[PDB]
Design a protein around this ligand. Structure first.
Ligand SMILES: O=C1C(CCS(=O)c2ccccc2)C(=O)N(c2ccccc2)N1c1ccccc1
Length: 472
């Protein structure tokens, strides 16, 4: 009988907007902390240190010192034992360290800890660890908001994000950095889930719309915030601190947001629920029907389609999170990318939804997965000669794939006895977080041809979309 009480106290109004703003604003920095492993763990051009150069015709010295590499470049992992002056066989690996190109980035973790050459596999493992941390933190938090509340967990998760992010920027050794990024990921997942649930609960029956949409926009924009912040600060120690600093103020000001009143009723804290509802009514200025609340009212108040949905969620998560953390391979001028994936995301998603809803729900679901997979696959076919076409296809593909989590959540998830969709969205999204940890691990196939990762990332979504047509 809670919706009757909610209609009695308010609905829409003023408080539901202020709370919405204050709970959606964290989402931008939550995205910023998640896409940060693209300007922090960036790989600049590296050479082998040689005594003849870099102190104790520069082009001639570079030619004699290092053997040439295959890709029209000097070798990045080998060095001549002695200066081969015969150039107007016997090679040894780098042992005095490397030298890097300090022209776009001042200091990355790759530069700091030498995650190049033989120890190349370490880099595509930090992102996998981070995503596994998100999955684990989201799994634990579910049975954590039923014994501690729903607003306290949000504030404590804010504090954990801030402290762990600040501490992770001062570590001198790689495993400590990985562990603290794991903790950051878990706390971020907790923040995500608790914010979503809090936005759902306090809103009236029209929460399915706006509210849930207002979340996504958060990400989209956030993307651009990540891009701008990255363009701002170049060093990697001063990027993590600058990103994790706001969360302390977020935790400080999150001490006044009212806690969800529906949860308080089921546990037995009637007085707190009364105070909460009265203060919400006072904020909403609907202090006319509140006198009816005299405790007693609240005292009396107290299979194939599923598999298709799981496959679609898995394909979307796997492709997006195994391809959008390596944007240095999709083009150039990285700061312009990762800042064009929201400005393309919004118009494309709205236009595609509006245009394809009328044709049919299954048609829209199918067309949202074949198109971006084919777009990504077509990136290989084009050569390097046209860079604009080389980069626009990837942006269009990512923007179109971003519409999947919107189309398959609000328009889909009704493919069931139609009792409540909250038991289906989470079930589908579990495979989305469980398919991203199996993501960047594909990029470990750089050896044995470089086209295989892109080929897999292009064939998986198209196969999932083609299988989606087999509903009957
Ligand atoms: O927007 C989200 C959240 C939603 C959880 S949520 O709102 C909730 C609702 C109801 C009950 C409990 C919790 C999320 O976890 N991912 C995600 C994380 C890791 C891997 C894959 C997906 N994305 C997402 C979607 C598209 C593009 C990027 C990110």
């Amino acid at each position: 009988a809670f919706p009757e009480l909610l209609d009695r106290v308010g609905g829409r109004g003023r408080f539901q907007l202020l709370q919405a703003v204050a709970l959606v604003t964290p989402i931008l920095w939550v995205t910023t902390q998640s896409m940060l492993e693209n300007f922090s763990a960036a790989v600049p051009h590296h050479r082998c240190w040689v005594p003849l150069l870099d102190n104790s015709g520069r082009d001639v010295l570079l030619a004699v010192s290092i053997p040439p590499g295959p890709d029209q470049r000097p070798h990045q992992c080998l060095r001549f034992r002695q200066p081969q002056w015969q150039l107007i066989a016997d090679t040894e690996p780098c042992e005095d360290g490397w030298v890097y190109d300090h022209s776009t980035f001042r200091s990355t973790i790759v530069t700091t800890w030498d995650l190049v050459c033989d120890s190349q596999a370490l880099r595509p493992m930090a992102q996998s660890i981070f995503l596994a941390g998100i999955l684990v933190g989201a799994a634990v938090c579910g049975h954590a908001s039923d014994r501690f509340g729903r607003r306290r967990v949000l504030t404590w998760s804010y504090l954990l994000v801030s402290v762990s992010g600040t501490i992770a920027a001062l570590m001198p050794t790689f495993p400590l950095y990985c562990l603290f990024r794991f903790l950051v990921a878990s706390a971020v997942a907790g923040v995500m889930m608790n914010t979503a649930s809090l936005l759902m609960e306090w809103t009236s029956a029209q929460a399915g719309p706006l509210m849930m949409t207002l979340n996504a926009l958060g990400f989209s924009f956030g993307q651009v915030l990540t891009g701008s912040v990255a363009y701002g600060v170049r060093s990697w120690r001063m990027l993590q601190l600058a990103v994790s600093a706001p969360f302390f103020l977020f935790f400080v000001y999150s001490w006044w947001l009212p806690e969800s009143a529906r949860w308080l009723i089921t546990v037995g804290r009637l007085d707190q629920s009364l105070r909460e509802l009265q203060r919400v009514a006072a904020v909403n200025r609907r202090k006319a029907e509140a006198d009816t609340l005299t405790v007693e009212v609240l005292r009396s108040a107290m299979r194939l389609r599923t598999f298709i949905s799981m496959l679609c969620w898995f394909a979307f998560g796997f492709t997006f999170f195994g391809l959008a953390l390596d944007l240095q391979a999709l083009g150039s001028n990285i700061f312009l990318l990762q800042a064009l994936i929201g400005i393309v995301d919004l118009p494309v998603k709205m236009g595609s939804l509006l245009l394809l809803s009328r044709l049919g729900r299954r048609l829209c679901q199918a067309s949202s997965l074949v198109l971006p997979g084919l777009c990504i696959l077509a990136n290989i076919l084009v050569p390097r000669e046209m860079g604009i076409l080389r980069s626009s296809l990837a942006v269009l593909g990512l923007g179109s794939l971003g519409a999947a989590f919107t189309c398959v959540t609000i328009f889909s998830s009704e493919l069931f006895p139609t009792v409540i969709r909250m038991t289906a969205v989470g079930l589908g999204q579990v495979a989305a977080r469980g398919g991203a940890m199996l993501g960047p691990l594909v990029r470990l196939l750089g050896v044995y041809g470089s086209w295989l990762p892109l080929l897999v990332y292009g064939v998986v979504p198209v196969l999932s979309g083609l299988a989606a047509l087999l509903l009957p």
